[PDB]
């Protein structure tokens, strides 16, 4: 029973990470799906150009959630790596407040929100580069924590 | 020992729905009918939330997604409750389009279609509250088909 | 939606323990806990403490336990608290809440005097 | 924990005019605020919840802003039936911590 329960604290920690990556995905799926679109009564989505600013309010909110959920991560084992994904997210969305003179505003570009959240975008200078190292960041994490799982099960055939 | 972590599957695959549901409670409750400010983060800007609303939208197209490509035939009928009312959640905003099918949508009217706690859910919050119980429902049974098979630790 | 209903009114004397319930109903608490809240005559509103709905985990503020006791029954959605050796000080209205969204569901109190 | 500090202590405002309380968290806390105005004898009700939104039944007089650590509710014109004792609530994991409270009283 001495491993049952660091089985248990070593799953805890995979499913907090798993849930701040389905957040990113999401940020993922609106940049790609839903910038310069608007709802459509039957193909669904639609064009709709340059008035992002609402979408953008909401991907920089999933993006306070990530940073909320990094901050109430904690693992002495992976110490480094969490706080490595954390400073990633503050630095994220400490760049989308930095260009809020094109961010800020109903009527964001379709062309500006590509660059601000659009992590594959051929220009990323308004976050979709900061986005990108979060990305990074966290599946360095996931990667370990898994690790970190995978070497506690393996404790009961060996 | 491995139904045990063929089950798991499915509650990770649930899991990322929930999580994904839960994105579009935060925008819900903190993105409509705001901007991104340098010092506040996020401040007033209302009634232009249709872009914020295709994000629901697309958000929402992806939990579809996954719902459909979860098969096992414990939770079979569980997953196909899930399934049916996420669709009938898609179909409820695409219904009210003439509302959230444009740029200047109101604050009013979002609320109405993805905020779930709105007094009024004429839109596509009430769907949407049935979307959430129905993937929780989902949830718990994911997390009894582990945990009794993982009973058998000390059992 | 969520609906709480909570037990009848109490008077005890001190020395002796009484325990509350308060039955939840209508949508999961999206973080699966139901809170405890104490407000005594004159003070404000002070939280307690919570309960997983989930686990039946208990979690309290430094000012009660060792005394203070949560439980919960799953089936019936029903959580629990249970106070020893009753003081006047405990002569509160005790609230159980629990959130669905960012949405706090309430109410609608239980009395308690503790007197001879 | 994150401490929240309410402040006035207490207002005396006439009908028709302007209030706002302030509630400031010790750290930031997201927007993830609840407002309740209580009457004497009876259970707080909710006004505001995640910092912005009206819960059920709240008129349109009542607003909530703020983000970070400064919050604050605002009644744009008060009504004779808004006298109480205002508290806020950070609303997010545990502990859910209460303001001390501001007491509305409407001056006459």
């Known amino acids: 029973t001495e491993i049952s329960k660091k089985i248990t604290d070593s799953n805890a920690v995979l499913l907090a990470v798993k849930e701040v990556e389905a957040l990113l995905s999401s940020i993922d799926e609106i940049a790609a799906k839903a910038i310069g679109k608007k709802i459509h009564q039957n193909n669904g989505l639609d064009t709709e150009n340059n008035h992002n600013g609402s979408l953008l309010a909401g991907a920089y909110a999933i993006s306070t959630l990530i940073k909320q959920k990094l901050d109430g991560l904690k693992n002495e084992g992976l110490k480094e790596k969490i706080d490595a994904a954390k400073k990633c997210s503050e630095t994220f969305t400490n760049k989308l407040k930095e260009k809020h003179t094109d961010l800020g505003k109903e009527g964001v570009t379709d062309a500006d929100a590509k660059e601000a959240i659009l992590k594959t975008n051929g220009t990323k200078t308004k976050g979709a580069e900061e986005l990108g190292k979060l990305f990074e960041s966290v599946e360095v994490l996931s990667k370990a924590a898994k690790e970190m799982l995978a070497n506690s099960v393996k404790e009961l055939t060996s | 020992s491995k139904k045990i972590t063929d089950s798991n599957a499915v509650l990770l695959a649930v899991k990322e729905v929930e999580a994904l549901l839960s994105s579009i409670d935060e925008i819900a409750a903190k993105a409509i009918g705001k901007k991104i400010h340098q010092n506040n983060g996020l401040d007033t800007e209302n009634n232009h939330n249709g872009s914020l609303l295709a994000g629901a939208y697309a958000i929402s197209t992806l939990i579809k997604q996954k719902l459909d490509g979860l098969k096992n035939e414990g939770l079979k009928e569980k997953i196909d409750a899930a399934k049916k009312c996420s669709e009938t959640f898609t179909n409820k905003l695409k219904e009210k389009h003439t509302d959230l099918g444009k740029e200047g949508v109101t604050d009013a009217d979002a609320k109405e279609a993805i905020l779930k706690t709105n007094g009024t859910k004429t839109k596509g919050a009430e769907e949407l509250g049935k979307l959430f119980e129905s993937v929780e429902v989902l949830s718990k049974a994911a997390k009894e088909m582990l945990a009794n098979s993982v009973k058998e630790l000390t059992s | 939606e969520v609906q709480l209903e909570e037990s009848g009114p109490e008077q005890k004397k001190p020395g002796e323990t009484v325990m509350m319930s308060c039955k939840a109903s209508?949508?999961?608490?999206?973080?699966?806990?139901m809170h405890w809240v104490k407000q005594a005559p004159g003070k404000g509103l002070k939280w307690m403490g919570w309960?997983?709905?989930?686990?039946?985990?208990?979690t309290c503020a430094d000012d009660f336990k060792g005394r203070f006791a949560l439980s919960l029954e799953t089936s019936s959605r029903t959580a629990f608290l249970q106070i020893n050796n009753l003081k006047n000080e405990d002569t509160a209205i005790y609230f159980c809440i629990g959130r669905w969204g960012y949405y706090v569901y309430w109410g609608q109190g239980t009395t308690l005097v503790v007197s001879s | 924990d994150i401490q929240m500090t309410q402040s006035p202590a207490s207002l005396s405002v006439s009908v028709g005019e302007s209030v706002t309380i302030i509630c400031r968290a010790s750290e930031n806390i997201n927007s993830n605020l609840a407002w309740y105005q209580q009457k004497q004898g009876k259970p707080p009700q909710l006004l505001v919840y995640?910092?912005?939104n009206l819960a059920g039944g709240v008129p349109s007089r009542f607003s909530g802003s703020g983000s970070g650590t400064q919050y604050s509710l605002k009644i744009n014109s008060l009504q004779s039936e808004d006298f109480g004792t205002y508290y806020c609530?950070?609303?997010?994991?545990?502990?859910?911590?209460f303001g001390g409270g501001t007491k509305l009283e409407i001056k006459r």
């Open positions: 309960i997983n709905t989930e686990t039946g985990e208990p």
């Open positions: 609530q950070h609303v997010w994991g545990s502990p859910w911590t």
């Open positions: 209508g949508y999961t608490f999206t973080d699966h806990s």
């Open positions: 995640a910092a912005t």
